[PDB]
Amino acid sequence: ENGYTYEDYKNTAEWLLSHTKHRPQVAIICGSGLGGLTDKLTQAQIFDYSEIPNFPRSTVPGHAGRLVFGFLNGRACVMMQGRFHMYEGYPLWKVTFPVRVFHLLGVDTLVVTNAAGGLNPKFEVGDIMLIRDHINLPGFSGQNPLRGPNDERFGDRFPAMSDAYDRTMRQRALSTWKQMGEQRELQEGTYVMVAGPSFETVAECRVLQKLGADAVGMSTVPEVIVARHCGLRVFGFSLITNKVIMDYESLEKANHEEVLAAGKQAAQKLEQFVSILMASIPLPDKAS
Amino acid sequence: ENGYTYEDYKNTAEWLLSHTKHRPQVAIICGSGLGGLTDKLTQAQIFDYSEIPNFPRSTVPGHAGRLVFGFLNGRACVMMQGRFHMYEGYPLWKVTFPVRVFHLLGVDTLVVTNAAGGLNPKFEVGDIMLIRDHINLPGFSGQNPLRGPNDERFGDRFPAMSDAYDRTMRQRALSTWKQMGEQRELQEGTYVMVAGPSFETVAECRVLQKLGADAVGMSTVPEVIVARHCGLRVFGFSLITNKVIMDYESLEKANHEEVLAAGKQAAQKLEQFVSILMASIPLPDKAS
Amino acid sequence: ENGYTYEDYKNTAEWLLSHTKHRPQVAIICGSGLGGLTDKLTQAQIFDYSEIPNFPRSTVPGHAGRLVFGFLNGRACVMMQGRFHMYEGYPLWKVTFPVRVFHLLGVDTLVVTNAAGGLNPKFEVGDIMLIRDHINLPGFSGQNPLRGPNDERFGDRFPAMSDAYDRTMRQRALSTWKQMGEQRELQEGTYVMVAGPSFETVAECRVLQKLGADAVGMSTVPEVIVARHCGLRVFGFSLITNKVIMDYESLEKANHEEVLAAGKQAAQKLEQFVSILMASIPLPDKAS
Ligand SMILES: Nc1nc2c(ncn2[C@@H]2O[C@H](CO)[C@@H](O)[C@H]2O)c(=O)[nH]1
Numbered sequence: 096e097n098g099y100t101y102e103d104y105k106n107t108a109e110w111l112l113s114h115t116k117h118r119p120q121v122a123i124i125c126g127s128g129l130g131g132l133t134d135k136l137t138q139a140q141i142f143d144y145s146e147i148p149n150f151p152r153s154t155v156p157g158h159a160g161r162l163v164f165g166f167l168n169g170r171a172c173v174m175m176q177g178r179f180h181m182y183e184g185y186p187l188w189k190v191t192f193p194v195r196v197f198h199l200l201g202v203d204t205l206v207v208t209n210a211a212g213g214l215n216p217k218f219e220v221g222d223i224m225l226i227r228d229h230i231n232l233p234g235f236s237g238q239n240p241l242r243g244p245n246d247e248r249f250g251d252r253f254p255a256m257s258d259a260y261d262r263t264m265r266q267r268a269l270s271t272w273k274q275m276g277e278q279r280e281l282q283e284g285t286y287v288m289v290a291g292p293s294f295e296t297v298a299e300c301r302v303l304q305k306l307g308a309d310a311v312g313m314s315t316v317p318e319v320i321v322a323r324h325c326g327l328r329v330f331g332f333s334l335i336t337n338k339v340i341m342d343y344e345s346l347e348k349a350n351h352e353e354v355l356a357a358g359k360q361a362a363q364k365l366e367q368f369v370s371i372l373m374a375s376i377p378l379p380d381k382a383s
Numbered sequence: 384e385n386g387y388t389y390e391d392y393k394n395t396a397e398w399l400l401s402h403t404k405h406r407p408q409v410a411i412i413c414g415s416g417l418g419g420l421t422d423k424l425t426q427a428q429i430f431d432y433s434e435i436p437n438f439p440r441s442t443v444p445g446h447a448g449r450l451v452f453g454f455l456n457g458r459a460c461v462m463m464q465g466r467f468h469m470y471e472g473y474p475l476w477k478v479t480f481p482v483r484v485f486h487l488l489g490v491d492t493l494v495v496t497n498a499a500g501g502l503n504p505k506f507e508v509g510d511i512m513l514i515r516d517h518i519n520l521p522g523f524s525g526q527n528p529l530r531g532p533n534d535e536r537f538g539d540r541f542p543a544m545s546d547a548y549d550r551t552m553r554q555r556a557l558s559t560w561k562q563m564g565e566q567r568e569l570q571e572g573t574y575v576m577v578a579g580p581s582f583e584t585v586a587e588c589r590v591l592q593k594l595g596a597d598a599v600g601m602s603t604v605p606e607v608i609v610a611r612h613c614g615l616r617v618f619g620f621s622l623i624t625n626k627v628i629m630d631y632e633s634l635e636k637a638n639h640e641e642v643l644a645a646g647k648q649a650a651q652k653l654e655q656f657v658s659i660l661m662a663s664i665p666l667p668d669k670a671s
Numbered sequence: 672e673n674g675y676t677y678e679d680y681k682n683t684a685e686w687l688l689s690h691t692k693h694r695p696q697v698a699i700i701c702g703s704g705l706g707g708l709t710d711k712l713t714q715a716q717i718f719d720y721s722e723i724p725n726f727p728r729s730t731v732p733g734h735a736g737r738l739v740f741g742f743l744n745g746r747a748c749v750m751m752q753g754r755f756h757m758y759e760g761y762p763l764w765k766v767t768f769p770v771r772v773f774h775l776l777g778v779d780t781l782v783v784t785n786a787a788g789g790l791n792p793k794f795e796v797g798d799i800m801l802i803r804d805h806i807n808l809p810g811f812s813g814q815n816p817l818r819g820p821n822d823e824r825f826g827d828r829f830p831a832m833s834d835a836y837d838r839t840m841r842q843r844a845l846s847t848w849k850q851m852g853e854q855r856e857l858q859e860g861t862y863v864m865v866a867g868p869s870f871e872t873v874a875e876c877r878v879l880q881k882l883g884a885d886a887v888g889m890s891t892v893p894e895v896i897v898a899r900h901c902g903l904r905v906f907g908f909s910l911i912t913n914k915v916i917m918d919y920e921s922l923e924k925a926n927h928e929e930v931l932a933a934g935k936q937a938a939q940k941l942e943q944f945v946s947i948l949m950a951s952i953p954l955p956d957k958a959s
């Protein structure tokens with residue numbers, strides 16, 4: 096919404112279209128540390144957000160602020176390396192701008208990834224949580240990427256998220272994790288977005304558990320929202336990089352610097368995983 | 384607050400006063416689908432929000448963006464057909480602007496209506512929930528219509544909502560529902576405002592149940608707030624248009640398009656109901 | 672963040688430094704009614720926020736909108752009489768501006784006080800709650816004072832609050848309350864910030880209890896956040912001025928006007944208490 100007019104997206108879509116010979120079918124928003132997933136492409140054509148018209152230029156990070164097209168295990172992709180977040184200051188209509196451009200690029204499916212804390216005790220750091228549902232905390236308070244006048248050309252005023260994360264892909268992945276033979280079945284849980292760049296206190300960590308969330312992160316949710324609004328089929332994972340201290344015995348920490356996990360073959364694992372799933376995303380062509 | 388100066392309201396109040404021979408006593412903010420309640424007026428004098436100075440012009444809707452004075456079952460009214468919401472983009476000081484003008488129009492009571500999802504399982508779609516209390520989610524995070532410097536001319540800095548919805552009118556309605564002989568007693572529950580124009584996921588639906596809310600909507604609460612701040616006696620209903628999917632068995636939906644209910648004689652029912660209650664609102668005159 | 676550039680703080684710090692011969696070590700943000708704590712100073716040098724460059728001038732209050740340096744029981748202090756709040760309209764980067772200046776003034780410890788409602792039933796109005804943890808409600812939704820590009824010169828992008836309130840000072844106070852011989856041990860609980868200037872409904876009062884909070888206030892939390900971000904050791908109290916009506920039997924009220932408590936020797940008590948603790952804050956010098 097606000098700031099971008101429907102034609103802003105059109106222009107950015109057309110430009111891109113007339114700049115990559117590529118027509119993506121799957122948009123992949125690499126979450127922290129899983130940006131390397133880009134390396135798996137072929138016919139990769141890189142675009143710095145900055146070069147792409149209207150696209151939110153990366154803030155301080157920038158490093159890895161590029162939009163990579165090309166192919167992933169037999170899918171015309173378009174990866175977004177380094178997503179945008181609320182805490183960096185981007186109004187949510189900028190955070191999610193890419194999703195709307197993607198859809199206009201033909202993209203009909205969006206796989207969103209992220210690194211998030213483990214709320215569910217059973218989660219072992221290193222895990223990979225297939226997102227089955229989200230609790231949009233900043234949205235309860237108004238921070239919904241859909242706020243503002245709705246453009247019927249993208250979607251309905253009150254779209255429903257009840258079914259955000261595609262159920263099939265959920266199966267097609269619970270199974271793929273298995274068909275691959277990965278030991279600990281890919282987990283599943285409710286991802287709770289939480290903004291602010293700081294990390295949860297033990298007290299916040301427990302309202303999150305209480306509210307029902309299994310993993311705590313600071314993004315994805317706005318992207319899932321404007322994607323669903325457009326119709327994009329959506330499924331995503333969540334690399335549990337750490338265990339949120341639910342205990343006052345405390346004296347430990349899940350800090351980002353300790354991303355490590357998101358540097359481990361953990362990242363690589365979720366990478367190949369995501370690259371396998373490509374085969375399981377419905378090819379618009381079908382061929383029957 | 385912000386954007387409107389105390390005299391902005393004064394001007395809009397005076398203009399209105401010097402444009403309708405009507406002096407309202409009850410302001411009625413018709414919620415989605417109960418706007419038809421307008422049809423029950425007499426001496427109805429319509430004002431398009433747009434014509435009224437300083438008044439927030441309706442966004443995309445507009446259709447039914449009018450302020451209707453006149454009378455309801457022996458009360459000098461002023462209905463607002465089509466309220467303003469956070470999701471349309473209106474800063475809450477615009478959403479609630481009307482309530483402050485109303486008070487300056489002499490209005491001493493505000494009946495607020497809305498269409499909201501059913502969180503309490505016992506609620507059957509179609510019901511009518513007398514609002515006994517609200518959980519202001521977007522306010523916990525700052526989105527309170529009272530934020531900004533307080534104008535003692537409207538009220539106190541830290542007004543209390545503990546007692547938002549007038550207890551009498553609650554009786555005077557639990558009973559009127561009965562005195563009328565309506566079968567299923569008018570329900571009662573906590574209305575939880577939730578912004579964002581999208582609908583609740585099954586995961587959000589459950590934190591709402593957990594937090595204690597019985598119905599989930601995207602408005603009213605800011606209006607109740609600035610009304611109480613002014614002193615307006617306040618009572619309101621909530622047409623449970625659908626049942627929020629608290630279950631993962633899911634495969635159903637409460638979407639707005641399926642408003643239906645809010646088109647049914649349900650709307651009409653809550654209408655006549657609201658028109659009866661007019662007799663039960665304390666006439667400033669009294670006559671002892 | 673936003674609005675203030677790193678050098679804005681530098682300038683305000685230098686100005687102050689070159690205007691008070693004082694070099695504070697402890698910043699004390701007096702909460703409502705405990706501003707009198709100022710009276711306990713020596714070599715007190717007052718600065719009206721207004722006179723200090725870049726400093727957020729007080730809104731309507733103003734009265735008691737001053738920054739008082741000087742000494743408290745053997746500590747070079749700098750008290751802030753009358754803090755800034757979200758409900759007054761200050762963007763959180765203004766609310767917390769002082770904390771960042773303080774740190775640049777050399778301040779290495781911040782004792783934050785506030786007046787807050789009692790959620791935990793056991794709390795008797797009048798009590799004093801040593802803050803052991805906070806639940807940042809407006810932050811869950813984005814209202815974190817750290818939002819925006821992070822300045823590594825103040826701190827890390829994702830600082831951790833798991834350990835906001837210094838554990839030592841917590842002991843050093845649970846004990847000091849005792850070493851002093853005060854009867855009812857100083858309480859302890861989770862402080863939940865909640866913005867909006869209005870007060871909790873019985874329904875909101877219960878989600879707060881449910882979420883785990885013991886006291887409910889409308890500030891502190893942003894200050895604790897940017898303090899921790901800078902490294903400031905932090906501990907704070909909370910004068911339970913009233914009992915939040917968790918009961919529908921209701922017919923009572925905790926309203927600010929009924930601050931009283933915060934006027935009582937209660938305020939004075941928490942004052943001398945805070946002045947004793949000065950001796951227990953680690954002198955940067957140490958002397959071994
Ligand atoms: N809210 C939250 N986010 C986390 C946590 N651990 C990792 N993250 C995510 O990983 C990055 C920081 O490590 C951010 O972009 C967060 O989304 C955690 O414990 N809590």
Ligand SMILES: Nc1nc2c(ncn2[C@@H]2O[C@H](CO)[C@@H](O)[C@H]2O)c(=O)[nH]1
Pocket residue numbers: 253415497498499500501577582583599600601602624625626627637638639640642
């Ligand atoms: N948050 C929420 N609002 C609803 C629901 N059902 C109806 N509404 C309300 O009705 C309109 C959309 O149907 C909006 O103005 C909402 O206030 C529901 O399940 N959840």
Ligand SMILES: Nc1nc2c(ncn2[C@@H]2O[C@H](CO)[C@@H](O)[C@H]2O)c(=O)[nH]1
Pocket residue numbers: 541703785786787788789865870871887888889890912913914915925926927928930
């Ligand atoms: N949210 C909340 N704040 C309170 C309450 N009682 C006192 N306060 C605080 O005291 C002032 C008003 O009395 C505000 O600055 C609040 O932080 C209460 O019951 N709820």
